[PDB]
Design a protein around this ligand. Structure first.
Ligand SMILES: [Mg+2]
Length: 372
């Protein structure tokens, strides 16, 4: 019936796209919004600072855009302030040459459209390839299957959160973009989620966290103005992401093009295999033991930090049975720390050593994070 034929049609269409992409010599890139390529806030403090050229935060707010949104319930309206990550225009422009772009956000569709309107005014970058929490199919997680149910060999994902992707092998976790300091992700059981959301938005509009932190910084008599200014433009993560993305593409089409041995629907490259290969080298050789990092209520080997570290080739042990190379500790003289210190061959470092190493795709010198 109109289902057997339909499913066969959808399947043909899916393989068509995979073929189309390889003929354009491109891949698919799933792009997250919040804290990946933008940062948003409803803290009215932004509008106030933007209206005062003499304000210490004025200069870094010159490129900030805003828009209004009223949604679902009883027309709750909010003025959103959007800060685009440095170099975004060029990143999208350049990356579009190697990847077909898709947006996949946990924000609402209305939210996504407004953001898309600004970053993609001609609609050529993303077209209609935009997924929001209104049509993704989940309020807690993202799935490659929502976009590529049968073949994910050509899809790369860039997102600041690895948990919403189950630390999928196709994921390139990005350093969270936190321009509006102290503000996290304004977008994080539908009506039950909307409630707490509208609550976080209100708490932000009334508590003015930005003003609160800026005031605190100024209330500390000093001379170095810069260190007293809350907002700063010191992020060029996109230039780094561009490099990694160019490499993945290059490696994929190198393996792909050299699949010369009946290139029909025989065998092709797989970003899902290529990416892990690239990351596995970073912390290969490291055996990590955590102390005061993972809550006892949470499982260690399934914790986000552990999975993040393992995606980069590190091993995560639970005890000293097999002496770990590093003890990731949370500034607390625990029995694990004492133990490792007595062994003298274990590097006792702060969590930062690991998160910064993972963020830089490079095993950093323990010396700067060493506790023992
Ligand atoms: Mg995000």
């Amino acid at each position: 019936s109109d289902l057997t034929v339909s499913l066969e049609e959808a399947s043909r269409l899916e393989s068509e796209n995979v073929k189309r992409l390889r003929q354009e010599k491109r891949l698919s890139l799933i792009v997250d919004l919040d804290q990946t390529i933008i940062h948003a806030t409803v803290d009215p403090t932004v509008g106030e600072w933007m209206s005062d050229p003499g304000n210490v935060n004025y200069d870094v707010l010159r490129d900030v855009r805003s828009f209004n949104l009223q949604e679902g319930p009883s027309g709750y309206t909010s003025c959103y302030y959007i800060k685009f990550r440095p170099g975004l225009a060029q990143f999208l422009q350049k990356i579009s040459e190697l990847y077909e772009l898709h947006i996949y956000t946990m924000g609402t569709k209305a939210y996504a459209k407004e953001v898309a309107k600004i970053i993609d005014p001609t609609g050529k970058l993303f077209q209609d390839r935009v997924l929001s929490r209104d049509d993704s199919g989940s309020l807690a997680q993202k799935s490659l299957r929502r976009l590529f149910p049968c073949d994910t060999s050509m899809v790369v994902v860039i997102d600041d959160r690895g948990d919403v992707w189950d630390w999928n092998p196709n994921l390139i976790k990005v350093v969270p973009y936190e321009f509006f300091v102290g503000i996290g992700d304004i977008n994080s059981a539908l009506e039950e989620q909307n409630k707490e959301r509208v609550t976080a938005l209100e708490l932000q509009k009334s508590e003015r966290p930005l003003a609160k932190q800026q005031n605190a910084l100024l209330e500390d008599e000093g001379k170095p103005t810069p260190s007293h200014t809350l907002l700063h433009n010191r992020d060029h993560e996109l230039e780094r992401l561009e490099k990694v993305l160019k490499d993945i593409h290059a490696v994929y089409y190198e393996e792909e093009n050299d699949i010369s041995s009946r290139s029909g629907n025989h065998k092709h490259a797989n970003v899902g295999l290529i990416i892990p290969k690239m990351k596995q080298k970073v912390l290969k050789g490291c055996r990590l033991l955590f102390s005061g990092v993972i809550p006892l209520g949470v499982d260690v080997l399934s914790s986000d930090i552990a999975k993040w570290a393992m995606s980069f080739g590190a091993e995560v042990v639970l005890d000293f049975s097999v002496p770990p190379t590093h003890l990731i500790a949370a500034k607390i003289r625990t029995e694990k720390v004492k133990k490792a210190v007595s062994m003298g061959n274990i590097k006792v470092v702060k969590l930062n050593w690991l998160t910064e190493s993972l963020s830089q795709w490079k095993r950093l010198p323990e010396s700067d994070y060493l506790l023992y």
